[PDB]
Structure formats: structure tokens, C-alpha cells
Design a protein around this motif. Structure first.
Motif, PDB file in Angstrom:
ATOM      1  N   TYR A  46       0.854  -1.214   0.000  1.00  0.00           N
ATOM      2  CA  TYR A  46       0.000   0.000   0.000  1.00  0.00           C
ATOM      3  C   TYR A  46       0.881   1.252   0.000  1.00  0.00           C
ATOM      4  O   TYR A  46       0.679   2.198  -0.808  1.00  0.00           O
ATOM      5  CB  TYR A  46      -0.944  -0.051   1.195  1.00  0.00           C
ATOM      6  N   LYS A  50       1.079   4.250  -3.022  1.00  0.00           N
ATOM      7  CA  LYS A  50       0.802   5.683  -2.738  1.00  0.00           C
ATOM      8  C   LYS A  50       2.017   6.559  -3.033  1.00  0.00           C
ATOM      9  O   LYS A  50       1.837   7.763  -3.068  1.00  0.00           O
ATOM     10  CB  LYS A  50       0.261   5.797  -1.317  1.00  0.00           C
ATOM     11  N   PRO A  55      -2.966   7.729 -11.015  1.00  0.00           N
ATOM     12  CA  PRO A  55      -3.651   6.438 -11.012  1.00  0.00           C
ATOM     13  C   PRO A  55      -2.997   5.420 -11.949  1.00  0.00           C
ATOM     14  O   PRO A  55      -2.877   4.231 -11.586  1.00  0.00           O
ATOM     15  CB  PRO A  55      -5.074   6.857 -11.440  1.00  0.00           C
ATOM     16  N   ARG A  58      -0.012   3.864 -10.287  1.00  0.00           N
ATOM     17  CA  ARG A  58      -0.534   3.037  -9.151  1.00  0.00           C
ATOM     18  C   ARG A  58      -0.990   1.692  -9.720  1.00  0.00           C
ATOM     19  O   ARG A  58      -0.613   0.603  -9.234  1.00  0.00           O
ATOM     20  CB  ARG A  58      -1.678   3.733  -8.440  1.00  0.00           C
ATOM     21  N   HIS A  80      -7.835  -2.457   1.257  1.00  0.00           N
ATOM     22  CA  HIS A  80      -7.974  -1.052   0.844  1.00  0.00           C
ATOM     23  C   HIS A  80      -8.965  -0.968  -0.305  1.00  0.00           C
ATOM     24  O   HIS A  80      -8.692  -0.277  -1.270  1.00  0.00           O
ATOM     25  CB  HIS A  80      -6.582  -0.535   0.475  1.00  0.00           C
ATOM     26  N   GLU A  82     -12.102   0.266  -1.107  1.00  0.00           N
ATOM     27  CA  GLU A  82     -12.754   1.505  -1.570  1.00  0.00           C
ATOM     28  C   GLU A  82     -11.713   2.361  -2.302  1.00  0.00           C
ATOM     29  O   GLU A  82     -12.036   2.916  -3.350  1.00  0.00           O
ATOM     30  CB  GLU A  82     -13.393   2.186  -0.370  1.00  0.00           C
ATOM     31  N   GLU A  83     -10.490   2.454  -1.770  1.00  0.00           N
ATOM     32  CA  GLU A  83      -9.442   3.292  -2.386  1.00  0.00           C
ATOM     33  C   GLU A  83      -8.919   2.627  -3.671  1.00  0.00           C
ATOM     34  O   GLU A  83      -8.638   3.350  -4.669  1.00  0.00           O
ATOM     35  CB  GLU A  83      -8.332   3.562  -1.378  1.00  0.00           C
ATOM     36  N   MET A  84      -8.745   1.321  -3.672  1.00  0.00           N
ATOM     37  CA  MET A  84      -8.179   0.589  -4.837  1.00  0.00           C
ATOM     38  C   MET A  84      -9.190   0.466  -5.991  1.00  0.00           C
ATOM     39  O   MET A  84      -8.716   0.374  -7.142  1.00  0.00           O
ATOM     40  CB  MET A  84      -7.629  -0.797  -4.458  1.00  0.00           C
ATOM     41  N   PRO A 431     -16.281  12.139  -0.631  1.00  0.00           N
ATOM     42  CA  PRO A 431     -15.943  12.385   0.764  1.00  0.00           C
ATOM     43  C   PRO A 431     -17.191  12.752   1.552  1.00  0.00           C
ATOM     44  O   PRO A 431     -18.187  13.240   0.989  1.00  0.00           O
ATOM     45  CB  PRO A 431     -14.961  13.574   0.755  1.00  0.00           C
ATOM     46  N   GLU A 497     -16.393  -2.884   2.409  1.00  0.00           N
ATOM     47  CA  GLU A 497     -15.226  -3.614   2.970  1.00  0.00           C
ATOM     48  C   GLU A 497     -15.622  -5.033   3.343  1.00  0.00           C
ATOM     49  O   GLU A 497     -14.732  -5.900   3.405  1.00  0.00           O
ATOM     50  CB  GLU A 497     -14.628  -2.851   4.146  1.00  0.00           C
TER      51      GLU A 497
END
Lengths: 547, 547
Positions: A46, A50, A55, A58, A80, A82-84, A431, A497
Motif C-alpha cells: 500500500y 501511494k 492512477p 498506481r 484497501h 474503496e481506495e483501490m 468524501p 469492505e
């Protein structure tokens, strides 16, 4: 033994091999000396992700991890998620396909085209895949009709296969990504010296179906246990494909059937929070394509199933808006077939001629819900949201058009304008918004909530086909997973999640419905919910070091 | 058969498999349909590289090609060598090690440390490498003393091994990259949760040599045919390592011995172009470290070999400048051992006290050559270059300090200030400079000119050791490869693109010198130059599809 272990992505553990294992396996001195746990490797990866700004970089890092340590890759995605998700799938994956298609060359793609006509079954047989469970197929034509990717659409199949593994524990060896290359209308690609696909415009419908028919027949013989999922097909074919194959083969389209299942589940939970019960809702459906009308019909179907309201009364809650305005039987045009069933019968011709702009349609209809399926930008204005507040204490506002630019309203604006009263589901993650010290955050209707569980359920039950009942059952299952606690906190879905538990429950309910319909071919499964759920959870592949 | 071929980087050809091959090997339908030649794949990969903005992303793309198609990787590097060198080695490789060390995890690194004391031979035996030819070893300490990389120094060994394959056709299966992790003084790493090496400060000399002695003894037994090349060791050890091992093992240090060989060859060609013959040169050596004095001694050795001038007279052509000023026996300090042999005996104490700044040293010495080995920035000023023009029609100006920021003068300024008269060799590639419609471009003294051929020669001849005679022979061979045509055009070296022919000639001459000294252990080789050269060329691995 030795470096053969370190270069096998399914059995490599990298630095998670203990010192004793390294000695036994002849890899002492082929790794740096630190020993990590899986959780430590995930934290390290992770941070390596970052370190990259963009993107696409990444994504490129995650591809390298997928190539060297499959368990670590999936473990990182699950920690991770939601972020991935925006990196490993929409929208990054489409940019990877369009401009970085070399990232996919090493993956287990299967490529069909008219040059291989009559050889499709031989190609599948030579791949030597035993007990394949999920096949994702695209032609790179694009559901949203933008950036025809042609052959480079293989990356969409590859990314979507990865989401079955992460979301439902389909074993990564039992999933196959497929491109049916029938040409491309992408003029850049047709001129590009480095485009490796069929260099011709897209085949006509007759030849298109001759090849896709051979594909479906071949897959039914060589991959007989698989679910075939159509991904990212254009509107001229995606609905007709489902009409052609739904009864004869084990197949579904996530863009059409998955989206409607997911949206319907969140929308019914939004009605529950509103207190304004389904037959008291007045719903503006902004957008009148086949897909949008499919979502409204899936909402009505789900409310009829959950509550046994008569479906005709639920249909009368919908006010469909197309590019001309409110869809009515008295407007004077010949309506497309898909618009007729939702057309108002209760609005005069004189009123229809004054029901063209969304602001005047909202003033007249006095809706309690705005469903944004329009694909035309920020149509849910401040003036429109303030009107909905005149008709309900809890406006339901679903800006579902993608990307965030095409979306009907920002959740931030929806919550601000309603002083926290709006109940919001989004097509993209946003957010949280804080108003008066109270925090609000939209519920994202991600397709991940449904297709993995339908794949795992259909892989286990081996149904003869995937009738509409199984998708409706999946929609209901998802709705019912939202806990009293989740609902008290304003959430419309169970948390993303928790996707493994979600998928195991969706799969369980899908299997029970296939058992009720007597279309299930796997007679080993339990037939009661508690025992089946436990069985399904044990069947799932998990990204932990096993041996 | 099948995807096992596509996932074997040594035998995969990707899109260069013909349609008939794809059918025979059961990979029809595992590739997009276009068939490419190798040259076409190279052109495509070169465009995939140039799509990336930053060197590190270019590097990352090339790593992925190296992982999937070894032949295509080396074919791409050989087709674009001058452009690729700064990406696949200095300076990009050091940035990859320092901040992107995950890029190296999948490569064939071998890792030693004090935890494995007494097991080094077992580690080597378990790697199962037959007939290893080249081993590159580093401790990550850095020759230029900046950015201690510790364990992450494995990437330097990996990049340098790749240059033996590209430059001299060492088969990529017969080269081994090694990190001797004796700790790190990098305080960031010692605190970094994600640093995977020995988390302690660098071992003292006694323990350092106990481990490096075990390494050399183990490699001599398990990899008995290999050349051991020390790379990127700090000055407190790099010279002492060579004194400890040069006679007992088959080893060299490219930073020390390769640099001096390369510089000496270009410098002698610069003297030839100048017409100012070696005994008429007056050379300012700006920089008085052990390495700089090594280069001056290598120049003198080469001129003595090529021309049979007495070496004592060639030593009197050098004016060594340290941080205090001109190095003389009458200056009043106790000189370091390495400075004494080049110290002026012909300069009074009164003159020595007035010979401190480079400008006044140049005014007094009236040099014909400036050798920039100073590591302190742009010391060769306009005023200094104009003075050298008073002493020779063709000033030799070698700004060799790296990086381009630390360099003594830009080739552009050297050519402008001398109106095209300067003869220039650089440490880095520079664009051409045009003056009055006449084009000038510096000759880059890349280390690639020598170490690959020394490795290929030592791999073939299997000498008992690598005495100074073999490096001097390599220096001479390189000098003599510069054609009358190359020299008429101002070049000091043969072209870098011709590295295979260069390496084959350097190797041939190295083998002949090992044969003259009777230190060669391979009795199969020809003993005459034409026949040996042909034999050496046939032995080289080439990045073409073979089977």
C-alpha cells in the motif's frame, strides 16, 4: 524448490517465507533477510502504491504485484478496497486499455476473431482450464459508447475477472478473461502501427452473431460449469445479446442486470429511511434510455417482491423524463417500446405541452425522489432540490450518471440545500459532508455488491440459466444485508469492505432461488439457509497463505 | 506448450510467433492476431517507453519487458543503446534502488549477510547455476559516497549484469547479481519500516573481510569459471579489496580499472588528433584522489605500451592539483602515498606558495590538456580555457566529473571558447554543438566500452586471475578500434552502437594477452587473432529469436 517457487505467482510468498522455510525450500539468500507477515506485506505494498502520483502508475505497480504474488495482490485490494477500486477498475482500467494496453499482455487473455472461425472450441480446449467458473467477455465496444477500445478491451475483461476473485473468492485459476475482436471503429487505432487487433471496422450484425453464437456454444461445451458475463458491450447489442442467450446459456450482463439490482436495493432502503412508503413516492426518472427504464422496472419488481404491492400501482409512482420532457400518452409523438410502459396516462395533452423542462416537470409532478440516469450533467439544480423539499421531509436524490462531471448534483450540494435531509446514493465515491457538526456521506451503489455473489452462486449451483428471478433475489438479499445499525447511520448498503460476507449471502440466496426453481445442477449443496451460508463461505478462495 | 511458453521469458516471442507456430504450440487465441517481426516489436516497445515522461517510469516499463521477453528486452536496448543507457543504468538505476527497490524483487538476486556466515557456499550451490560466467557484487556503499543504498544496492548489481549481456553477449542465464549486505549507514533506511536489509550500521573492517573472504572462496568453488566484478564499493574498501584479491581470484573493479582503461584510450586518441605528441603534452590533472591518480598512471602505462616512451618521462607530463593547489615536493606538507609519484620535483618552494588557485596554476604550467577528475563543479572557466589556447592549437579538455552539475566545463562552452579547436571527452552524453556551420560533439568515455569485453575475454580464457596487463591490453584494443575515418571526424572512441564488435575485439586481445602470460585455463581457444576474433563473435549471445 528454489527460485521456481519465487517465480510462481500462486505459491510465492516473498518475504513472508520464514527463515526455516527459506532453508527447506533452497531460497535462503534469494530474499533480503527481513521476514514479514502477510499483513506487513500488504502495508508495505500500500505504501509502494501511494508513492505514485497518478492512477495509471498506481495501476502499473499493482499489475507487477499481481504478476509476482497473487495472494499478496488480492490481500492488498481487500484491505484497501474503496481506495483501490477506482485504480483496478473504472475509470483507470479504461485509460490503461486505451493508452497502456501493454500492461495486459502477460495476463491469461483469450482472444477470438473471424480468422479463427470454427476453431473457437479448439482454442478453449488448448487453454486446458479445468472447472472454469467465470468467463468475462467484451468486444471493447463500450456501454457508455465512448473510446471504442477494440482488441484492447481485453483489459476490461481482465479487470472485471479480478473483481470476482476479490469480491466473491472465485479462485483466480478458475476465471477467464475473453476479448471477442469483431473490429473497431476507433479511427486512431485503425491507423496505429502498434494496434495489434483486427484492423477493420466493426462487423455487421449477421457476422457478429455468427461469431458470438460460436463462442457461446464452444464455452457451453468446453467450460460447461462457467457463468458467461457480458461486459461493456454497446447499446446496439447488449440488450439483444441477453434476449438471444438468457434462456439457452448460463449468462448475464452486469451493466444492465447488475446495475438495476444494486440501484433497486439502495433505493428501497432510501424509501425506508424516508418514511414516505413506496406507494406514496412520486419518482422523477431523469433519463429514458433502455437502461434507465430497466432500473425503474427493477425497483418496481423488488418492491412487489418485498411488500406484495401490486406492480401496476408501483409503476404509477414513476414519472419518466426523456430529452423532449415528461413521457405521456398525450404528448403527440410515437414512443419507443421501452418508454410506453412508464408513460403517464393521467396527464392531458395541454399539460404535456407545458412539461418540457425539468424545473417545470418537478413543479407539476411534486416528486419526493429524483433518480438521475440522464448522462447529461448537473440537471438537479438548487431550485429543483428546494422544490422536492416542499413535497417530503426526506428527499431521495440519486445522481447516478458517471463520471462525476455528468452527475446530476454533487452529494455535497444535495446535503447543503436540504440542510442534511437528502438521502443520497452516488455512482462514484465522495468524501463526507459535515453540516452543523453532523456528518453525511452518500451510499455508493457499486456494482461490486451484486455480480461477485451472482457469479459465486451460479458457480456453486450450476443453474441451467440465469433467469430474472436470480437477479431479483440478489437485489433483495443485498437490501436485507443493510443492518438496523447501518440504516440508523443513513447507509443504504452494507459496507463495501465486508464484500466477502455480502457475496456469501447474495450467493446463498441465489442458490436457494435456483433450488426453488429446480434449475440447479449441483446436488451436493445444502438446501437450508444457515447450513448453505456456512458451506458457501468455506468454498470461497481467500487471499491468505494456505500452502 | 501453451501458456507455459508465453510465461517463460527466455523462450516467449509474443506477437513474433507466426500463425503456424501459434497453432502448433497451442497459443492460437492467446495473442492478438497481428504477427510482428523482432524489429517491429522493438519499434513498438521503444514507443511504449517514450510514452512515459520520467526516466523512472521508462525504467519500470523496461523491467516489465525484461520479465516477459528477455530477447525483446535486449534487442530494444541494443537498437537504442545511447538513449537507453541513462535509464537502465546510471543515473536512473540509483534512483530506482533508493526509492523504487520493489522493481528488483523478481530478478535473480543473491543476498549474503552475517546471519548466513558459513552457509555462503550452500546458498550458491542451491541456486543451481551451471557455468556462471560473470558475478557482479556490491555492498551498496557507493563509489561516489552519496546515497548509501544498503541491501537496495542489489539493483546496481542487477543493472550492471544487464550491461554485460547487452554489451558483450554474456548469456543472460550465466550472470548472477549479488548484494553483500554488511549493514547501512543510511539513517532513513535504519528507521524505515519497509527497509528489508540488515537493520544496523555498516560492519567494521575485520568482520567485513571475514564475510567478503567467505564470499570469494565460496564463489571460487561453486562458480569456478566466473569473473567476480566489484561494483559501487566506497573508497575506504574498493582499492584495498583489489589489493587483497587481485592475485588469488578472477576479479576486477570497473569503477577503478575500467574507468582508467576507457579514459586512457580516449586520451591517447585526443593526443593523436592534437598533433602535440605525448612527451610534448603538459597535462593538468584537476583532482588528486586515488582514482584520479590511477587514471593518470593508466594513461602513462598505455602511452609506454603503444609508443615505448620511457614511463618516467611520461610521468613528468602530469601536473597534479589537489585541494591545496599544485602537488610539489617543495610545498611543505606530508603528501599521501598516491600523490608522491606525480608530485613535481622541478618547482621551487617560493613558486609552490603561489600555485594554489587553478587559474594561477594554469598560467604557470602552460598546459596543453585539462583533465577534470575534481568532483567539485565548473572549475575550467572561460579565462582558463583561453590560457590553454595560448599553449596549443588543439586544447584537450576532459570534464569527466559526474553528474553534469559537478563537471568541470560543458562541452558547448569548451567548443565555443576555442572556436571548435577543443578536443573533448565527457563523462555523460551531450548534444552536438554547431559553430560556424561546423558540428562538434564530445566523445563520451562510457565504461561500457571495456568491462563487457573484459568479462567475455575472462569467461572464454578462464585466466587464473586478471592482472593489470589484461586491463592495459583492453585499453589498447579500444584505442586501436577508433578508425582513421572515426578520427578524421573527431571521435575518440569507436561508436557505442557497435558495442558487440567492440567487445569481441577487446575480448580477443584480452585472451591473447592471457595466452602470452600462460594464465589461460581454456585450451580450446584459437591462438591467432583473426581465427580467435571469429570464434569469440560466434560465442556471443545475441538478442534474436533462435529456438
Amino acid at each position: 524448490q528454489g527460485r521456481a517457487i519465487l517465480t510462481d505467482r500462486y505459491i510465492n510468498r516473498g518475504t513472508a517465507f520464514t527463515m526455516e522455510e527459506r532453508q527447506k525450500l533452497h531460497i535462503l539468500g534469494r530474499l533480503p533477510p527481513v521476514v514479514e507477515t502477510l499483513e506487513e506485506q500488504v502495508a508495505r505494498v500500500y505504501g509502494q502504491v501511494k508513492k505514485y502520483e497518478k492512477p495509471i502508475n498506481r495501476y502499473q505497480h499493482l499489475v507487477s504485484v499481481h504478476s509476482t504474488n497473487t495472494t499478496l495482490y488480492y490481500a492488498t485490494i481487500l484491505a484497501h478496497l474503496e481506495e483501490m477500486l477506482p485504480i483496478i477498475y473504472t475509470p483507470t482500467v479504461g485509460e490503461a486499455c486505451m493508452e497502456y494496453s501493454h500492461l495486459f499482455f502477460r495476463e491469461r487473455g483469450v482472444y477470438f476473431n473471424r480468422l479463427y472461425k470454427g476453431q473457437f472450441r479448439n482454442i478453449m480446449r488448448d487453454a486446458g482450464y479445468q472447472k472454469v467458473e467465470v468467463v468475462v467477455i467484451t468486444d471493447g465496444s463500450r456501454i457508455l459508447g465512448l473510446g471504442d477500445l477494440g482488441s484492447n478491451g481485453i483489459g476490461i475483461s481482465i479487470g472485471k475477472c479480478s473483481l470476482y476473485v476479490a469480491g466473491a473468492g472465485i479462485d483466480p485459476r478458475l476465471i477467464v478473461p475473453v476479448i471477442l475482436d469483431v473490429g473497431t471503429n476507433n479511427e486512431r487505432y485503425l491507423q496505429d502501427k502498434d494496434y495489434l487487433g483486427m484492423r477493420e471496422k466493426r462487423l455487421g450484425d449477421e457476422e457478429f452473431y455468427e461469431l458470438l453464437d460460436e463462442f457461446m456454444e464452444a464455452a457451453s461445451a468446453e467450460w460447461p460449469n462457467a457463468v458467461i458475463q457480458f461486459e461493456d458491450f454497446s447499446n446496439n447489442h447488449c440488450f439483444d445479446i441477453m434476449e438471444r442467450y438468457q434462456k439457452k446459456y448460463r449468462c448475464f450482463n452486469d451493466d444492465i442486470q447488475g446495475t438495476g439490482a444494486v440501484i433497486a436495493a439502495g433505493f428501497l432502503n432510501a424509501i425506508k429511511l424516508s418514511g414516505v412508503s413506496p406507494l406514496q413516492q412520486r419518482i422523477v426518472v431523469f433519463g429514458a434510455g433502455s437502461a434507465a427504464v430497466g432500473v425503474a422496472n427493477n425497483i418496481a419488481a423488488l418492491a412487489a417482491r418485498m411488500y406484495k404491492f401490486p406492480v401496476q400501482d408501483l409503476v404509477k409512482t414513476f414519472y419518466l423524463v426523456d430529452t423532449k420532457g415528461l413521457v405521456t400518452t398525450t404528448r403527440g409523438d410515437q414512443l419507443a417500446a421501452h418508454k410506453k410502459l412508464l408513460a403517464r396516462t393521467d396527464v392531458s395533452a395541454e399539460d404535456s405541452a407545458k412539461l418540457r423542462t425539468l424545473e417545470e416537470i418537478v413543479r407539476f409532478v411534486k416528486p419526493t425522489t429524483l433518480l438521475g440516469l440522464g448522462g447529461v450533467g448537473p440537471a438537479f439544480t438548487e431550485e429543483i432540490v428546494k422544490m422536492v423539499m416542499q413535497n417530503t421531509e426526506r428527499p431521495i436524490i440519486f445522481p447516478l450518471s458517471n463520471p462525476t462531471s455528468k452527475a446530476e448534483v454533487t452529494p455535497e450540494n444535495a446535503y447543503k440545500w436540504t440542510n442534511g435531509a437528502a438521502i443520497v446514493a452516488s455512482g462514484s465515491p465522495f468524501p463526507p459532508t459535515t453540516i452543523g457538526g453532523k456528518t453525511f456521506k452518500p451510499s455508493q451503489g457499486n456494482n461490486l455488491y451484486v455480480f461477485p455473489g451472482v457469479g459465486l452462486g451460479c458457480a456453486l449451483a450450476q443453474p441451467t440459466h440465469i433467469p430474472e428471478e436470480l437477479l431479483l433475489t440478489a437485489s433483495e438479499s443485498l437490501n436485507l444485508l443493510t443492518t438496523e445499525g447501518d440504516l440508523r447511520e443513513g447507509r443504504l448498503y452494507p459496507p463495501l469492505e465486508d464484500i466477502h460476507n455480502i457475496s456469501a449471502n447474495v450467493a446463498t440466496d441465489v442458490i436457494l432461488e435456483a433450488q426453488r426453481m429446480k434449475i440447479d445442477n449441483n446436488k451436493k449443496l445444502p438446501r437450508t439457509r444457515d447450513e448453505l451460508l456456512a458451506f458457501v463461505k468455506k468454498a470461497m478462495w481467500k487471499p491468505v497463505y494456505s500452502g
